[PDB]
Design a protein around this ligand. Structure first.
Ligand SMILES: CC[C@H](O)[C@@H](C)[C@H]1O[C@@H]1C[C@@](C)(O)/C=C/C=C(\C)[C@H]1OC(=O)C[C@H](O)CC[C@@](C)(O)[C@@H](OC(=O)N2CCN(C3CCCCCC3)CC2)/C=C/[C@@H]1C
Ligand SMILES: [Zn+2]
Ligand SMILES: [Zn+2]
Ligand SMILES: [Zn+2]
Lengths: 106, 68, 441, 76, 85, 110, 107, 815
């Protein structure tokens, strides 16, 4: 008394958002409809994994911290303050729906 | 009941009412007899106290903890 | 990009209106609420002009506005319930021309919420208690007192919550220095959420519930609750004590009912209809607002329908019992959101849209030939009357109001150099196109 | 036990959900607080009363009447 | 058993002891006290009249919410007195 | 542009009959001064019915790059003691603050 | 401000670039058109004249003569899917209506 | 079975010594049980336990709640026992404990509501006529409680009947006492029934019995006190008898009538108030000469009450009232009389508040020089009260000279160190201000003589006087023997008594804080190295004053001592941020800010980072606080690069310290952080990608504090970017990590808005796995409880199915 993947793919307006477990929900039609809303980033993708969200591979061994360019170019007066606020740039930022996951650094 | 004035004042010491009392006594005796008889009481609930008749939030939380 | 906001012309639509002696003297003033602006007006009894004394931006949503006075005082206070989780009490200072905040009591989170009070506000007619209520289960009661310096003191709130309950309207009941009473139109929806057939949704009635505050025991109790015949909108406080009986008027669809707890039967009067009406016969008729005028000799009410017809309601009474409700056609004015009857014989009409009006009540008493309807009259079938031009009222003043603005164009369509504002505003047969120019005329 | 008390107080507030909440309960909750928000905000009611050509008291009464059973009666 | 009271708060002002004087009752911060704490009537009665809301010792000064808790409207819940069962 | 020889503004219209404008700042100094005026008036002159001013202008979305000039012009209606307490933090007298408030209004609107 | 009266709720207007005239559209719900009002009133008259009773005194001729002004007594709000719309050409200097096009009942 | 119900109603022990949950459970069940148990057994057992000789307060309060519940569950069955209950609880109404009285009144109120009025009257009427005066008082108080519970008009007929009783005067006395107790208990709520009560009690003022007249006057006074400032038409039939009585009576009854007059006068208009004052004033002037002291107290109260109204003007007062008042009341006999001493002071101050300060101040200032010191302290108290309430404006040359000479002579002629002379001297000099130029040499000589020796209890009082008067001491343009005083205060820096050292440090600080560091005699490079060892003293006053003094020195005289000593002093102050006292912490924060502003952020920041690396927990937390202080005083631009350079060390427990410092820094600077969010974003990225749990927990804390710090400033880009890294941690089982994640999410709900949060929750609200649903519904409930109203505009569209309608059609309208 539960849909199959191909049967539910025939009912929905957007079949490419249907997945393996989606037919096992209590209300798959509402689930697939919310998966197709014109926003609403998806789930963090590691809920079904078994490695506690930290992958022990990919060679994470790397430099500790690279300071920005503005970091390098009393200790410094209001002229070097002027320098730090003339050199200040906006860094790279990801938009609303770009979640991070273990792999997406390399 | 304390006031240095109250102590000062309370220190120097050395027909219609009857009719009203009689009427009150008759009414009171009738009411007492009716309650003792409990023969004709419909128990018409006057005012229901919602707080007295309804579990509080803390009581509900205790009940929930006991349940699980 | 950084922007600075400026207001050029404030809002002119009225939501609520109260009247009273807010300056402490014998003259009467009106406090009106815009959406987010509070405003004090004073109509001149010599010329009939309405002057604006004070206007303040409150930066919130005003949802309920009441006036009350303590016993022995000569000045009225203002109770405001808003979209914050606070009840506020204000006092007008005539010498400083500003509103002074007297009390602030916080009870919940901000915003127009389902279960946080602030939508309904009732006050005891003697001024010793105030009730703030939400549309859902939560209700709170504050006791108001006075110290030896004649300043107002407020107590901690008493709860009267009741789950799965909806409130239509709350009013305070006028008792003779007895325990304060509050009346509510309530509906329980618990049964309707459990029936999949949809039959518990129907067969569900409004109740008229009475809440008694026992100042000796300091708690609120449900005393009486009775199911009603059909669903009613707002309630009306009947003046009680030593001048009048102590009940409520329930305004409903096609009817108006008087009700009181005790041995008093229910009295119903159907609302009269206009003879040869051109409106759809399936539609009913409700009252939209009311105004009470109490006099040391008698009292009456003024209620207005959706068509804009004001009827004059009087009450035929006995030593304690009410026997008849009599209705008489009074006049026709635009549909109002609030009506205030002022001593010195003035009626203030704040319309839902468009200009507001101040009328002189020219004809006191009723020496006329037009019929007077009654609850004692038998009818199998409804009463009928003929609408006519103004007979009891005279128009004295008209306050301009741009609400609602629907379309605007700023353009130099004349051959001045300054542009004019062409504004399509208004609704129904009272709409208009207005040209606005900056300057004096 | 503070976290458990929070889990009991959050459940107490009307409109909150949990892992067994159905579509019907969610939707009637948002319909009900939508109607209350319409009753609260003065210019939304203005918009509706201009749109459907009714008095504001009539729109308020209609919303209160719709409050009882929004989205129809429940399942099974 | 560290649980807040969470009853309807009244006109009584919350108090803090000499050890808890600068603390916020909800988050235990010391920066920027902003809003005066109110407690219910059963927490302010008889022997409970003046007492620390955090621990229960003799109160010496007013309890406050921090600006961080005031911004999130955490001063809008019930009585914040710590009660043990 | 509303006045002859003035600057362009964004005029809006409301369902309650209100008319208002949003005008851009041209320098950082005016923006900073008006930001500090708004900050100090948010605390020492709070809304009358118990509302938080910053929370009201963030009703559905947080405010971004707008200064409420209807809160700022309430400075001219405070009492002289609080007007002095506010003005002495901006390193200024009340008449100078009043003149600065009137300048931006007369630059765009009436 | 100067005001010029309209018939229904105005929705939107445009400006003619050459003549500087205004083209306004007005529309209302629960509303009759002029023709529907006239024929509904004639219907009610002919039905009240045949009320089967002495047919000897005519309130119908008095009911048809004077129309109570809608700006004072309101427009008859009748129907749930009933509309009424109008297109108007107006001079903005004066208030005169240059042209008026009435549309059918439920448009 | 009988003890059946007893053994089961040991529920009251279930409650007495029981847990709160079972407390309320047994409460509810015994409430349901009451009607069937019966009032007989229930009361037979509870009234002994309430009569227990050593019951507690909370226990007694719980017993009251239980009685109220039984009264609710049994209304008309309590009648045959009412009498009994009363004999147990008619006491507790004259008890010296306030809460005992409240509990007794609540019990009697619930009993009167349970039973009827007729029953209460029938059980209470036999003790109306009793001869034992102890019973007639509890009876009147209980009748007042019953009137407050069931209403006044319900008892008005019984009252009207009982005080017309021709049978005995005791019944009339008790009825009038009932009216008086009703007034006392109900206050301003008697106003609608004022005239009824007044006409009920008014005929007693002319009785043949003297006890009835006295109690009637006391009841009139009580009603007038409850009514103020309203009600004078209701007191009209009493004006003639009261004044005729004060004209004919003499003694106790005269005192009662005068109390009534005094409570009635402030209710009148100017005419009546002015006319009535004259009459009662000639009578009161006659009564000034009375030996009785109760009479003196009543006369003083009436004088204060009448002289405070508008109908009485200063001319009549100074012409008729002041000579006899000052001739009869101002003698040291009044000073040793402790009972009326405060009354005399208050009456004199409130007289001066209307007639003018000059006359009062003169008439008593000639008396500042006196053989008795009690009479000296009295005059000083009155003078300084008047000076603080009105000032020294109309005080002139002769009066100024007399005041100064008197206060100087009173200061020297002092046996025990008292606060009276100290406060008098202080307020007199502070009110005179820049006017006392030569009495400044005089006062300096006096304080020099007092501070030179004599046991340091005179020296600490002199130091307090210096601390409170140095402002006016220097603002008069005089600095030299100011330095002479500072030299001596410096020499008095080694003291075994910490209380005197606190006052010495306070005086030194008040000096150096008010005189300029310029041109001042005692050198700073001498005071400060002598001052730094006192910072380790363990007395609170010494510590606070020393820290305040070092702070002032660092704020103004920073260029007089080397930076190395400043560094040592700040490193020593580091340990005072842990003080159990709030004033110590406040002063330490201030002084650290000053020292940091003085010596520069670079060296102190390097030292603070080194100290953060190597120490135990509490010292590292204090170092974090110190770093935040340095970054706030000297703009965070000067601290952030050096702190971010320390995160570059490839070693745990160093990066975690940097993260804790950043957390507290953003929490402490709040709004100032809007210019520094772009600089710390990559570091927070790195810390959120880390495997270490403390890294991610602290990064979440930083995100929360940063979010709540910038709100309304347009920093949503970086906060959304950081949310993209915070969100994957919602599936974390560790409690501390998930707590920090929830805090960060609720901060982003405010800074970023609820729409974004709902967009993050939508796809998980209905996930097939129960874990995802639990987590997402917790987050959603947190988003819903705050800002329920905004969510109305954010919900996504959901289409109708065959059974139900889900579209919100009103929002689709288009005008
Ligand atoms: C994470 C750090 C720890 O929680 C730590 C604070 C705490 O765990 C320790 C235990 C204990 C008892 O030693 C804590 C010490 C307390 C402190 C260092 C705080 O100092 C005080 O309490 C002093 C007093 O209560 C009030 C001083 C005051 C107002 O400066 C307070 O901080 C503030 O309110 N701020 C922060 C905001 N800051 C700006 C500056 C511009 C204008 C003022 C308001 C905005 C002003 C000063 C105290 C700060 C220390 C954290
Ligand atoms: Zn907090
Ligand atoms: Zn504590
Ligand atoms: Zn509590």
């Amino acid at each position: 008394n539960r849909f199959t993947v191909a049967e539910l793919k025939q009912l929905v307006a957007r079949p490419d958002v249907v997945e393996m477990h989606d037919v096992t929900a209590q209300d798959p039609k509402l689930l697939v409809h919310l998966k197709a809303t014109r926003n609403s980033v998806p789930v963090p993708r590691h809920w079904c994994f078994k490695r506690k969200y930290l992958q022990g591979k990919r060679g994470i061994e790397k430099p500790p911290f690279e300071l920005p360019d503005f970091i390098k170019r009393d200790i410094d007066y209001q002229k070097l303050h002027d320098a730090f606020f003339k050199w200040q740039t906006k860094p790279k930022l990801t938009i609303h729906g770009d979640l991070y996951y273990e792999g997406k650094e390399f | 009941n304390f006031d240095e004035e109250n102590a000062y004042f309370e220190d120097e010491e050395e027909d219609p009412l009857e009719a009203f009392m009689a009427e009150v006594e008759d009414q009171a005796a009738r009411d007492m007899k009716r309650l003792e008889e409990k023969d004709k009481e419909r128990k018409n609930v006057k005012g229901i106290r919602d707080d007295i008749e309804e579990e509080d939030d803390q009581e509900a939380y205790f009940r929930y903890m006991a349940e699980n | 990009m950084f922007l600075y906001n400026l207001t050029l012309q404030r809002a002119t639509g009225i939501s609520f209106a109260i009247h009273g002696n807010f300056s402490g003297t014998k003259q009467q003033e009106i406090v009106v609420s815009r959406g987010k602006i509070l405003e004090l007006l004073r109509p001149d009894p010599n010329t009939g002009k309405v002057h604006t004394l004070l206007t303040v931006e409150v930066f919130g949503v005003i949802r309920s506005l009441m006036a009350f006075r303590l016993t022995g005082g000569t000045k009225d206070y203002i109770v405001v319930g808003s979209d914050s989780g606070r009840i506020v009490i204000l006092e007008y200072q005539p010498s400083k021309n500003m509103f002074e905040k007297i009390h602030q009591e916080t009870f919940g989170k901000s915003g127009c919420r389902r279960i946080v009070p602030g939508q309904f506000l009732a006050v005891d007619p003697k001024g010793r208690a105030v009730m703030i209520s939400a549309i859902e289960k939560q209700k709170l009661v504050y006791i108001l007192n006075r110290d030896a310096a004649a300043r107002l003191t407020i107590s901690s709130p008493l709860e009267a919550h009741k789950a799965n309950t909806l409130v239509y309207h709350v009013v305070g009941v006028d008792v003779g220095f007895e325990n304060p009473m509050f009346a509510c139109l309530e509906m329980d929806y618990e049964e309707a959420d459990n029936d999949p057939t949809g039959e518990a949704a129907a067969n569900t009635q409004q109740t008229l519930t009475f809440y008694e505050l026992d100042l000796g025991l300091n708690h609120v109790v449900r005393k009486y609750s009775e199911p009603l015949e059909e669903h009613g909108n707002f309630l009306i406080t009947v003046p009680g004590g030593s001048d009048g009986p102590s009940g409520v008027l329930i305004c409903s669809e096609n009817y108006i009912t008087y009700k009181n707890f005790g041995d008093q039967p229910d009295i119903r009067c159907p609302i009269p209809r206009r003879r040869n009406d051109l409106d759809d016969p399936e539609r009913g008729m409700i009252f939209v607002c009311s105004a009470t005028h109490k006099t040391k000799s008698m009292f009456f009410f003024l209620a207005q329908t959706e068509q804009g017809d004001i009827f004059k309601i009087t009450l035929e009474t006995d030593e304690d019992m009410v026997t008849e409700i009599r209705l008489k056609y009074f006049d026709t004015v635009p549909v109002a959101a609030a009506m205030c009857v002022l001593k010195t014989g003035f009626l203030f009409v704040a319309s839902e849209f468009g200009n507001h009006y101040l009328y002189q009540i020219a004809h006191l008493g009723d020496d006329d030939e037009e019929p007077e309807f009654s609850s004692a009259m038998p009818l199998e079938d409804t009463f009928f009357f003929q609408p006519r031009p103004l007979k009891n009222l005279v128009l004295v003043d008209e306050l301009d109001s741009l609400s609602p603005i629907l379309f605007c164009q700023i353009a130099d369509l004349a051959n001045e150099d300054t542009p004019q504002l062409y504004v399509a505003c208004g609704r129904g047969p009272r709409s208009s196109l207005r040209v606005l120019r900056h300057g004096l005329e | 036990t503070i976290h458990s008390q929070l889990e009991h107080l959050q459940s107490k507030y009307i409109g909150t959900g949990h892992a067994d909440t159905t579509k019907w309960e969610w939707l009637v909750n948002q319909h009900r607080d939508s109607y209350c928000s319409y009753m609260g905000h003065f210019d939304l009611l203005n918009y509706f009363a201009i749109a459907e050509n009714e008095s504001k008291a009539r729109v308020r009464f209609n919303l209160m009447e719709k409050m009882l059973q929004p989205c129809g009666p429940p399942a099974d | 058993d560290l649980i807040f009271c969470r009853k309807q708060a009244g006109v009584a002002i919350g108090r803090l002891c000499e050890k808890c004087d600068g603390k916020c009752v909800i988050c235990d911060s010391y920066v920027r006290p902003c809003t005066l704490v109110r407690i219910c009537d059963e927490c302010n009665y008889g022997s409970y009249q003046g007492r620390c809301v955090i621990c229960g010792g003799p109160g010496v000064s007013d309890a406050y919410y921090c600006k961080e808790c005031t911004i999130q409207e955490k001063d809008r819940d019930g009585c914040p007195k710590i009660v043990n069962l | 542009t509303l006045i002859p020889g003035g600057s362009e503004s964004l005029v809006y219209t409301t369902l309650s009959g209100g008319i208002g404008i949003l005008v851009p700042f041209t320098s950082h100094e005016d923006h900073d001064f008006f930001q500090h005026v708004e900050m100090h008036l948010r605390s020492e002159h709070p809304p009358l019915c118990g509302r938080d001013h910053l929370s009201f202008r963030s009703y559905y979305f947080p405010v971004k790059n707008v200064i409420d000039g209807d809160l700022c012009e309430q400075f001219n209606s405070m009492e002289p003691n609080k007007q002095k307490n506010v003005s002495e933090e901006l390193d200024r007298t009340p008449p100078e603050v009043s003149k600065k408030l009137e300048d931006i209004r007369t630059r765009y609107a009436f | 401000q100067v005001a010029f009266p309209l018939q229904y709720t105005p929705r939107k207007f445009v400006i003619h670039p050459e003549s500087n005239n205004l083209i306004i559209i007005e529309t209302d719900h629960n509303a009759y058109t002029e023709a529907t009002k006239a024929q509904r009133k004639q219907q009610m008259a002919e039905e009240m004249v045949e009320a089967a009773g002495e047919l000897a005194a005519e309130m119908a001729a008095a009911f048809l003569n004077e129309n109570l002004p809608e700006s004072i007594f309101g427009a008859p709000k009748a129907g749930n899917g009933q509309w009424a719309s109008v297109i108007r050409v107006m001079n903005p200097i004066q208030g005169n209506t240059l042209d008026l096009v009435q549309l059918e009942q439920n448009e | 079975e009988e003890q059946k119900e007893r053994k089961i109603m040991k529920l009251l022990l279930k409650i007495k010594n029981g847990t709160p949950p079972m407390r309320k459970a047994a409460l509810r069940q015994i409430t349901d049980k009451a009607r069937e148990f019966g009032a007989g057994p229930l009361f037979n057992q509870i009234l002994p336990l309430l009569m227990s000789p050593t019951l507690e307060d909370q226990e007694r309060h719980l017993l009251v709640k239980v009685i109220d519940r039984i009264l609710y569950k049994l209304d008309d069955l309590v009648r045959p026992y009412v009498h009994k209950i009363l004999v147990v609880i008619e006491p507790l109404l004259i008890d010296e404990d306030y809460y005992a009285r409240v509990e007794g009144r609540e019990i009697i109120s619930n009993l009167a509501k349970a039973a009827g009025l007729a029953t209460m009257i029938s059980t209470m009427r036999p003790d109306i006529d009793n001869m034992d005066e102890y019973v007639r008082n509890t009876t009147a108080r209980a009748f007042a409680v019953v009137a407050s519970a069931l209403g006044i008009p319900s008892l008005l007929p019984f009252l009207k009947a009982v005080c017309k009783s021709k049978k005995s005067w005791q019944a009339r006395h008790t009825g009038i006492k009932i009216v008086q107790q009703i007034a006392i208990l109900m206050g301003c709520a008697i106003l609608p029934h004022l005239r009824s009560l007044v006409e009920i009690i008014e005929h007693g003022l002319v009785d043949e019995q003297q006890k009835v007249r006295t109690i009637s006057a006391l009841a009139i006074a009580a009603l007038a006190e409850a009514a103020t400032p309203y009600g004078i038409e209701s007191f009209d039939s009493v004006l003639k008898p009261l004044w005729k009585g004060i004209r004919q009576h003499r003694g106790k009854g005269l005192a009662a009538f005068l109390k009534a007059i005094g409570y009635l006068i402030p209710l009148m208009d100017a005419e009546y108030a002015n006319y009535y004052t004259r009459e009662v004033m000639l009578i009161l002037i006659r009564e000034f000469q009375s030996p009785d002291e109760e009479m003196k107290k009543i006369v003083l109260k009436v004088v204060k009450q009448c002289c405070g109204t508008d109908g009485v003007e200063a001319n009549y007062i100074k012409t008729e009232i002041l000579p006899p008042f000052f001739k009869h009341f101002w003698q040291h006999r009044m000073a040793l009389d402790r009972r009326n001493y405060r009354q005399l002071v208050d009456t004199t101050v409130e007289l001066a508040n209307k007639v003018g300060a000059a006359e009062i101040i003169s008439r008593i200032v000639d008396d500042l020089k006196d053989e008795a010191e009690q009479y000296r302290k009295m005059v000083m108290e009155t003078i300084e009260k008047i000076m603080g309430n009105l000032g020294a404006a109309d005080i002139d040359h002769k009066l100024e000279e007399q005041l100064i000479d008197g206060i100087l002579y009173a200061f020297q002629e002092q046996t025990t160190e008292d606060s009276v002379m100290l406060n008098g001297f202080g307020t007199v000099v502070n009110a005179l201000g820049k006017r006392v130029k030569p009495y400044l040499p005089q006062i300096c000589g006096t304080v020099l003589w007092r501070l030179n020796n004599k046991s340091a209890k005179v020296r600490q009082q002199a130091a307090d006087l210096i601390s409170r008067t140095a402002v006016v001491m220097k603002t008069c343009q005089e600095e030299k023997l100011m330095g002479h005083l500072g030299v001596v205060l410096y020499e008095y820096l080694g003291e075994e008594y910490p209380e005197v050292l606190g006052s010495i440090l306070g005086a030194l600080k008040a000096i150096v804080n008010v005189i300029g560091m310029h041109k001042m005699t005692p050198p700073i490079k001498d005071l400060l190295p002598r001052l730094t060892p006192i910072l380790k003293n363990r007395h609170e006053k010494v510590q606070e004053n020393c820290i305040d003094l070092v702070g002032r020195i660092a704020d103004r005289g920073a260029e007089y001592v080397s930076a190395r000593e400043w560094m040592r002093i700040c490193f020593e102050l580091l340990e005072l941020l842990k003080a159990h006292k709030k004033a110590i912490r406040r002063a330490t924060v201030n002084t650290f800010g000053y020292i940091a502003k003085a010596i520069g952020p670079h060296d102190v920041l390097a030292t603070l980072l080194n100290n953060l690396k190597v120490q135990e927990r509490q010292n590292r937390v204090c170092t974090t606080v110190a770093i935040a202080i340095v970054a706030e005083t000297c703009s965070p631009f000067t601290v952030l690069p050096a702190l971010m350079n320390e995160y570059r060390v490839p070693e745990l427990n160093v990066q975690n310290g940097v993260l804790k410092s950043l957390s507290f820094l953003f929490e402490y600077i709040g709004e100032m952080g809007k210019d520094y969010i772009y600089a710390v974003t990559p570091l927070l990225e790195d810390a959120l990608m880390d495997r270490d749990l403390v890294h991610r927990q602290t990064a979440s804390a930083v995100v929360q504090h940063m979010s709540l710090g910038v709100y309304g400033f347009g920093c949503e880009d970086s906060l959304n970017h950081l949310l993209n890294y915070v969100w994957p941690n919602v599936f974390e089982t560790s409690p501390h990590v998930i707590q920090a994640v929830m805090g960060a999410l609720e901060g982003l709900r405010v800074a970023i808005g609820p729409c974004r949060m709902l967009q993050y929750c939508l796809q998980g609200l209905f996930h097939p796995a129960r874990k995802v649903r639990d987590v997402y519904w917790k987050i959603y409930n947190s988003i819903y409880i705050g800002s329920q109203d905004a969510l109305i505009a954010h919900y996504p569209r959901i289409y109708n199915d065959d059974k139900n309608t889900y579209i919100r059609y009103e929002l689709d309208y288009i005008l």
